[PDB]
Design a protein around this ligand. Sequence first.
Ligand SMILES: O=C1CCCc2nc3c(cc21)C(=O)CCC3
Length: 203
Amino acid sequence: DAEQRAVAKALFDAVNKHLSNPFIEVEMRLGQFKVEEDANFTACVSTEDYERIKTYLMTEMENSSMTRSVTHDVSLRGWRHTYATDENGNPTRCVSIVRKKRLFVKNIVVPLGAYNLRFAVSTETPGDLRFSGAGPRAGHTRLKDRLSITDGMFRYDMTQVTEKGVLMHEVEIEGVFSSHEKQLTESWLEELLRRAMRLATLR
Ligand SMILES: O=C1CCCc2nc3c(cc21)C(=O)CCC3
């Protein structure tokens, strides 16, 4: 609780220099190390821990605004094209192209038995929509079924991702700001840690 105030300060001092950038994004991702063979950190939760994080979140903030969206992502030469989805789950029309550049990443120390936490600040710069002419299947694809709960300046993202047949579960919290420069504060970061640590520690 005092040590949590210190981490929040350490995070703020590292990222403050970046908030002047347009299109800045901040997120905390639950995950684990050495759960797949090619990767170090994998941003995923078990099917069981996903559904009780879902039950927790949906009772604790039932008043909160909520949305659900199915989208079709295709990665192409470092850019991400997002496609809307029809009844069956198939790509229709491209809705956004962004390029994501990681500006700062930090691994958060967690309690024993909890999911690992990864804090990242990046830029997601929108792009020229005429590149959508490459179509929804010009590269590796990800079908995302996202549940989104917004609570003040915090958005919870629970996503069932189907890639290459296998389905995985992702849990992240993002910053929701009218202006990241003014609003993303140290006291905000400390609440991010507090809320993210809650999710990581059930059971
Ligand atoms: O929108 C832009 C800006 C110009 C450079 C650029 N290059 C690529 C894309 C998008 C953009 C893609 O969507 C994937 C292919 C490479």
